[PDB]
């Protein structure tokens, strides 16, 4: 089900959040670390239903950001649906220490034949969100590879359509 | 998470199934009624992981259909993941008996302002799969409207990206 969240604006007068209009709906594109957004448990992928009571259905990215910018008081209220496009998939590394997919800009671009990823039916055109609980949104590809490399045999990732 | 299914080829030498390659993965596009696919509970949206042991990752629509066509013997085995893109949303009709969205060819094309659909954050470019348990895949728009009309106030629908 959805849920309500109350959060306050920081010194610089922001919440550390980017919103994207996708199919006439507003979605969290990035949540900056240690921000008011972070504390109340907002994460990349969350759907924004209302902002201060008003429905977001139909709003552009620009409209959604302009509402928050001129939003009145200390406290903004938001009705959220938790990552509705969330898919978790558990994979196992082979002898070479690989689960078997290629990615660019944190998005899966190809699957390796007869790998663990192929076995479990991983899909391309999906962004990597987490790896074993560690959020990888807004990291460089090399930083993602480090996390993959420093993982154990069991590799659980969370994905979403691009 | 996944599961195995065994099914036999019918008199006309088919299973009554269409498969579509989506993001280097095979998916059920349509399940013809009273077919071997229908028995054993295949439905539009299911992901095909293996066909007769072999991983489907990377296969084209043509490749996937060609495997089944020349597949040896009475019995085909398939590893399936049940509708992984499934999203349910419950809505309530207004005074005019409307939840507030437009659709064409069983796909949501627009949301009505300040409706129940807007309130609950329904998205366009999503196919309607069920309505209160009733499957509406392969129905005409008018037949869908009948089911909507003959629904009560509470309207639960299942959707998927187009
Ligand atoms: C094996 C390589 C090609 C692959 C990889 O580490 N694969 C993982 C998912 C596995 O199988 O453990 N990487 C690492 C990397 C770093 C920077 C930019 C792109 C990539 C990429 O595709
Ligand atoms: C309000 C009307 C135009 C709408 C509708 O009854 N939808 C409900 C779910 C609502 O608006 O709540 N319909 C009915 C129909 C029949 C055949 C083809 C398209 C449509 C369509 O968009």
A153 shares a domain with A92: yes
Last residue of a domain, one of B34, B63, B81: B81
B156 shares a domain with B103: yes
Q: Which domain holds residue B33?
A: 3-81
Rounded to whole angstroms, the Cα distance separating A50 from B94 reads 19
Q: How many CA atoms lie within 13 A of A134 on its CB side?
A: 13
Ligand 2 center from residue A46 Cα (angstroms): 28
Suggest the residue from B25, B49, B57 to mutate for an interface test with chain A (most A CBs closer than 10 A).
B57
Nearest CA in chain A to B83: A87
- Angstrom CA distances, A160 to B20, B44, B61, stand at 19, 20, 23
Q: Which residues of A touch B22 (CB under 8 A)?
A: 123
A140 shares a domain with A74: no
Residue contact A49–B121, C-beta within 8 A: yes
Rounded to whole angstroms, the Cα distance separating A123 from A109 reads 8
- Technique used to solve these coordinates: X-ray
Give the rounded distance of the alpha carbon of B28 from its chain centre.
7
Rg (CA), chain A: 18
Residue contact B24–A55, C-beta within 8 A: no
Resolution, in Å, please?
2.8
The CATH number covering residue A115 comes to 2.30.42.10
A58 shares a domain with A104: no
DSSP 8-state class, residue A73: S
B125 shares a domain with B75: no
A65 shares a domain with A28: yes
- Angstrom CA distances, B101 to A60, A102, A132, stand at 18, 39, 38
- Name the domain count of chain B: 2
Which residues are B103's β-sheet partners? B108
Residue contact B126–A24, C-beta within 8 A: no
Structure tokens at B150: 């003959």
């Amino acid at each position: 089900d959805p849920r309500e969240v109350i959060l306050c604006k920081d010194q610089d007068g922001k919440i550390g959040l980017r919103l994207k209009s996708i199919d006439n709906g507003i979605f969290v594109q990035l949540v900056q670390a240690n921000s008011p957004a972070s504390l109340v448990g907002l994460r990349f992928g969350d759907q924004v239903l209302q902002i201060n009571g008003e429905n977001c259905a139909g709003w552009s990215s620009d409209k959604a950001h302009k509402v928050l910018k001129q939003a009145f008081g200390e406290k903004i209220t938001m009705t959220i649906r938790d990552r509705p496009f969330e898919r978790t998939i558990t994979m196992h590394k082979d002898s070479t220490g690989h689960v078997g997919f290629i990615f660019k800009n944190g998005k899966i671009t190809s699957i390796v034949k007869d790998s663990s990823a192929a076995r479990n039916g991983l899909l391309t055109e999906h962004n990597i969100c987490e790896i074993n609980g560690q959020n990888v949104i807004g990291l460089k590809d090399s930083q993602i590879a480090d996390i993959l490399s420093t993982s154990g045999t069991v590799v659980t990732i969370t994905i979403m359509p691009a």
